[PDB]
């Protein structure tokens, strides 16, 4: 449901809801890359702040995680796991949930009948609706759907008054719903029925955020104004609980220690599967990494710890990968990121049954790509040039102001990839596999739709990182990532 989540209450307004409207164990989350959680307990209102600079959700007293559903399903099953400084247990019990539709796919607020009709007409098909604020009665909202099966009156868009009637709304008659979502889920689950038979079904929200590559930069500025990107992106932030995918593998014992983060996990039904592990290892075919199919294809990884620079070398091996993208140091603000898992430049070391040379380095401005053979040992024709390419400028918080040097490097990877025939998945890692990586990733995939088809195509931002989120958690962490991702395709259509 993901309810929990107020986009725009203040921290008074946060207590006194739960104080008021809420009890002993409820909390809710709210913003200001900053985030709170607020939990009720003993009558009184205690705040936890989380804080993501690109990584990870940081809990302060819990634990890292890939999105706050993931977050808030944790600790509403462990328990005991979050404590305060005193070391007594604060216990998630009970969403108070929030009311706004700002974060709603279907709403548009401010907006007319023949514009809703404009928009429906253009973009729409049978089931396509959104909610709008009632201008001819203010205060009151209208539901405007289409049906149907061009000019041919086969199709007709319908509107349905939402009274709003002391905070609860209706649509003229039946229940009055505490918000204009249970409404609209109420009415999506129970279609409404005209009289002459016609059933108004409520099927996807009118599509937005498609647009035609060329006016990118149009859009970058309508999302600049008063900002407008920050409702996009927290809009498909509420997506993220329709995301929650089993992630059971990561969590056996025997993996537990092949994770770099204890809860940023892969979905099982996307995982790398390693076969060919010698029978002594109860489990042998676990690394915390994923297939990204986009719908060229792509692995994401964590960074390597010391206890998987094995696994990681039978995942590119097995998978014919012949491309690497590190977007990390290997330390960062004093902390390990990635542990080296290639040889200095010459050498030749030996990782399990996997051997490495580093043939040749070369330095870049940005990054450094470092050319190196992987075979099995034992059987010499197995050969293969892996390339990695070690962007490292990236800074350790954020995103880079000017997306130039990321496109170049994008551009080389993308060149190199197509240069192999047969190349497995492009291996994307940071540290733990899904800001940067996911940032990176999604530029790459926006930007071979327009390497391909040009810039007279169409592109959807929130609907690509939705497709990749759903093949691993959190794909893309933070809104100035999302921010960066705009930029970049924007910077790369104005360099054709
Ligand atoms: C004013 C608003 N409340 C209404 C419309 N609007 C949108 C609309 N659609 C999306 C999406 C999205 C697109 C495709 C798939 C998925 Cl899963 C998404 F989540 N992401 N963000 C969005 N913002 C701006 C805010």
Redesign the pocket.
């Given at each position: 449901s993901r309810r929990w989540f107020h986009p725009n209450i203040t921290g008074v307004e946060a207590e006194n809801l739960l104080l008021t409207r809420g009890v002993d164990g409820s909390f809710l989350a709210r913003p200001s890359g900053d985030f709170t959680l607020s939990v009720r307990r003993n009558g009184a209102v205690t705040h936890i702040k989380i804080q993501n600079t690109g990584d990870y959700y940081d809990l302060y007293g819990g634990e890292k995680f890939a999105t706050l559903a993931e977050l808030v399903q944790y600790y509403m099953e462990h328990h005991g796991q979050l404590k305060e400084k005193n070391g007594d247990v604060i216990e998630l019990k009970y969403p108070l949930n929030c009311a706004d539709?700002?974060?709603?796919?279907?709403?548009?607020?401010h907006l007319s009948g023949k514009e809703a009709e404009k928009l429906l007409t253009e973009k729409g098909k049978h089931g396509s609706f959104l909610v709008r604020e009632s201008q001819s009665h203010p205060g009151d909202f209208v539901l405007s759907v289409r049906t149907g099966d061009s000019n041919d009156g086969k199709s007709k868009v319908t509107h349905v008054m939402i009274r709003c009637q002391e905070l609860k709304y209706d649509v003229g008659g039946g229940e009055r719903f505490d918000s204009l979502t249970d409404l609209v889920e109420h009415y999506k689950k129970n279609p409404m029925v005209e009289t002459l038979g016609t059933v108004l079904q409520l099927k996807q929200?009118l599509?937005?955020?498609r647009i035609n590559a060329a006016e990118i930069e149009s859009r970058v500025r309508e999302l600049s104004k008063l900002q407008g990107f920050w409702?996009?992106?927290e809009?498909?932030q509420?997506?993220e609980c329709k995301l929650l995918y089993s992630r059971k593998e990561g969590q056996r014992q025997e993996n537990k220690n092949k994770n770099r983060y204890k809860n940023i996990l892969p979905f099982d039904h996307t995982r790398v599967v390693l076969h060919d592990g010698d029978p002594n290892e109860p489990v042998s075919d676990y690394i915390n990494a994923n297939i990204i199919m986009p719908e060229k294809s792509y692995i994401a990884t964590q960074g390597c710890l010391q206890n998987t620079v094995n696994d990681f070398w039978r995942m590119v091996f097995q998978e014919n990968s012949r491309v690497i993208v590190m977007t990390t140091k290997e330390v960062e603000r004093g902390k390990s990121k990635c542990v080296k898992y290639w040889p200095d430049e010459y050498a030749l070391k030996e990782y399990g049954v996997m051997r490495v040379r580093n043939v040749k380095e070369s330095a870049a401005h940005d990054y450094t790509l470092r050319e190196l053979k992987l075979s099995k040992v034992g059987q010499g024709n197995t050969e293969r040039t892996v390339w990695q390419y070690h962007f490292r400028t990236w800074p350790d918080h954020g995103v880079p102001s000017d997306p130039g040097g990321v496109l170049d490097f994008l551009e080389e990877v993308h060149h190199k990839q197509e240069s192999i025939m047969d190349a497995g998945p492009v291996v994307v890692h940071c540290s733990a596999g899904i800001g940067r990586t996911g940032t990176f990733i999604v530029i790459d995939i926006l930007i071979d739709i327009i390497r391909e088809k040009g810039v007279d195509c169409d592109i959807?931002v929130?609907?690509t990182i939705?497709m990749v989120r759903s093949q691993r958690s959190g794909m893309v962490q933070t809104e100035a990532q999302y921010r960066f991702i705009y930029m970049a395709v924007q910077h790369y259509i104005e360099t054709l």
């Amino acid at each position: 449901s993901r309810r929990w989540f107020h986009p725009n209450i203040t921290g008074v307004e946060a207590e006194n809801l739960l104080l008021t409207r809420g009890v002993d164990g409820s909390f809710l989350a709210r913003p200001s890359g900053d985030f709170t959680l607020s939990v009720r307990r003993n009558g009184a209102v205690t705040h936890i702040k989380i804080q993501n600079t690109g990584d990870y959700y940081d809990l302060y007293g819990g634990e890292k995680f890939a999105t706050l559903a993931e977050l808030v399903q944790y600790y509403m099953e462990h328990h005991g796991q979050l404590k305060e400084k005193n070391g007594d247990v604060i216990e998630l019990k009970y969403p108070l949930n929030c009311a706004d539709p700002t974060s709603e796919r279907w709403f548009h607020g401010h907006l007319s009948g023949k514009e809703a009709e404009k928009l429906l007409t253009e973009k729409g098909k049978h089931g396509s609706f959104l909610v709008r604020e009632s201008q001819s009665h203010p205060g009151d909202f209208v539901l405007s759907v289409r049906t149907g099966d061009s000019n041919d009156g086969k199709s007709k868009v319908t509107h349905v008054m939402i009274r709003c009637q002391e905070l609860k709304y209706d649509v003229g008659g039946g229940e009055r719903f505490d918000s204009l979502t249970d409404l609209v889920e109420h009415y999506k689950k129970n279609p409404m029925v005209e009289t002459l038979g016609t059933v108004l079904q409520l099927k996807q929200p009118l599509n937005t955020t498609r647009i035609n590559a060329a006016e990118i930069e149009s859009r970058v500025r309508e999302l600049s104004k008063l900002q407008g990107f920050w409702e996009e992106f927290e809009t498909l932030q509420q997506q993220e609980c329709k995301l929650l995918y089993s992630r059971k593998e990561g969590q056996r014992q025997e993996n537990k220690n092949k994770n770099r983060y204890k809860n940023i996990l892969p979905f099982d039904h996307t995982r790398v599967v390693l076969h060919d592990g010698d029978p002594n290892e109860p489990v042998s075919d676990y690394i915390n990494a994923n297939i990204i199919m986009p719908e060229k294809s792509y692995i994401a990884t964590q960074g390597c710890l010391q206890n998987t620079v094995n696994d990681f070398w039978r995942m590119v091996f097995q998978e014919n990968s012949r491309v690497i993208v590190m977007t990390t140091k290997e330390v960062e603000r004093g902390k390990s990121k990635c542990v080296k898992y290639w040889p200095d430049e010459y050498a030749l070391k030996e990782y399990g049954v996997m051997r490495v040379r580093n043939v040749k380095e070369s330095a870049a401005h940005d990054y450094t790509l470092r050319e190196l053979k992987l075979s099995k040992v034992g059987q010499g024709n197995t050969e293969r040039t892996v390339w990695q390419y070690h962007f490292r400028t990236w800074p350790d918080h954020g995103v880079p102001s000017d997306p130039g040097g990321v496109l170049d490097f994008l551009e080389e990877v993308h060149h190199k990839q197509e240069s192999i025939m047969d190349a497995g998945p492009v291996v994307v890692h940071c540290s733990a596999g899904i800001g940067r990586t996911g940032t990176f990733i999604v530029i790459d995939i926006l930007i071979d739709i327009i390497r391909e088809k040009g810039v007279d195509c169409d592109i959807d931002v929130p609907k690509t990182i939705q497709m990749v989120r759903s093949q691993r958690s959190g794909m893309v962490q933070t809104e100035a990532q999302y921010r960066f991702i705009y930029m970049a395709v924007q910077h790369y259509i104005e360099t054709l």
